Amino acid sequence: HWGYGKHNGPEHWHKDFPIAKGERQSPVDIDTHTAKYDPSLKPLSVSYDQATSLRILNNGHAFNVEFDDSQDKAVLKGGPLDGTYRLIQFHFHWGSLDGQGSEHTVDKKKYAAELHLVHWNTKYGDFGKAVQQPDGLAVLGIFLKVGSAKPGLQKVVDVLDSIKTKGKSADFTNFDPRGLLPESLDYWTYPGSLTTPPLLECVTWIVLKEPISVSSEQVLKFRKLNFNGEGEPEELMVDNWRPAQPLKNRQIKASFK
Numbered sequence: 001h002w003g004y005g006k007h008n009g010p011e012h013w014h015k016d017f018p019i020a021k022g023e024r025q026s027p028v029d030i031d032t033h034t035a036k037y038d039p040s041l042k043p044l045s046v047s048y049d050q051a052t053s054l055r056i057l058n059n060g061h062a063f064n065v066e067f068d069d070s071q072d073k074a075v076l077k078g079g080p081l082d083g084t085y086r087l088i089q090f091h092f093h094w095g096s097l098d099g100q101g102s103e104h105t106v107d108k109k110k111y112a113a114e115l116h117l118v119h120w121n122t123k124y125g126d127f128g129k130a131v132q133q134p135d136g137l138a139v140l141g142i143f144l145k146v147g148s149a150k151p152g153l154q155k156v157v158d159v160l161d162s163i164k165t166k167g168k169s170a171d172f173t174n175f176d177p178r179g180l181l182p183e184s185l186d187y188w189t190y191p192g193s194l195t196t197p198p199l200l201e202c203v204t205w206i207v208l209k210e211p212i213s214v215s216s217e218q219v220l221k222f223r224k225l226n227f228n229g230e231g232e233p234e235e236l237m238v239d240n241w242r243p244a245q246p247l248k249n250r251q252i253k254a255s256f257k
């Protein structure tokens, strides 16, 4: 029964998930002047040419575009990572207003939304095992700002009417997640956590510096989704973001000068 409401939102999560007050929680504010360039961060490798999307699901928190992760079809390697991380799903966090919605912030700036491409370390065999490990997941985070449309997002936008309410799914094959990437792969990285319960401290975060732009109409369609199930009181799926958490004993590294 966690969520994003007044009575069950981020300030309440610690009562069921005490790791919410842990040593490596996410998201964080990225202080760009304090991040340090790490010249040894070896090139990042996004290999999504053989990606196989399967389905899109409204899980009551967000919507997930799910991939076949039973082979190395869409993988992330390089950068801070040791080994191979398979893409399992992507989702977004977004606001009720264009001035909020991202989970990470950059010098305290919120973006309108944030895309999370979730990958698990193949050495752990399955996603469920990976989330129990400190290096189990790699999440590629991409900021969204409102401006020009993102053509490669439109197929996602257009299916949302079919998954309005919690528990709905729709087949979603042949979607190419390369159409959601910015031009540059410059990034910041730090060790953190899942940003929703169970808040497990299993993530290497890789947050791209360059935001993608989406149109006002595209984000407006995100905001028509519902947190509730069909036949329950309508509650718009907006402001499904956790605010920045204390950095504690962490350094954020930059791939770029």
Ligand SMILES: N=C(N)NC(=N)NCc1ccc(S(N)(=O)=O)cc1
Pocket (backbone or CB within 6 Å): 116, 118, 131, 139, 193, 194, 195, 196, 197, 198
């Ligand atoms: N551990 C689970 N709940 N299992 C699962 N299927 N996904 C959980 C999950 C995956 C990614 C993120 S995020 N926002 O940090 O990218 C939060 C939660």
Ligand SMILES: [Zn+2]
Pocket (backbone or CB within 6 Å): 091, 092, 093, 116, 195
């Ligand atoms: Zn997320």
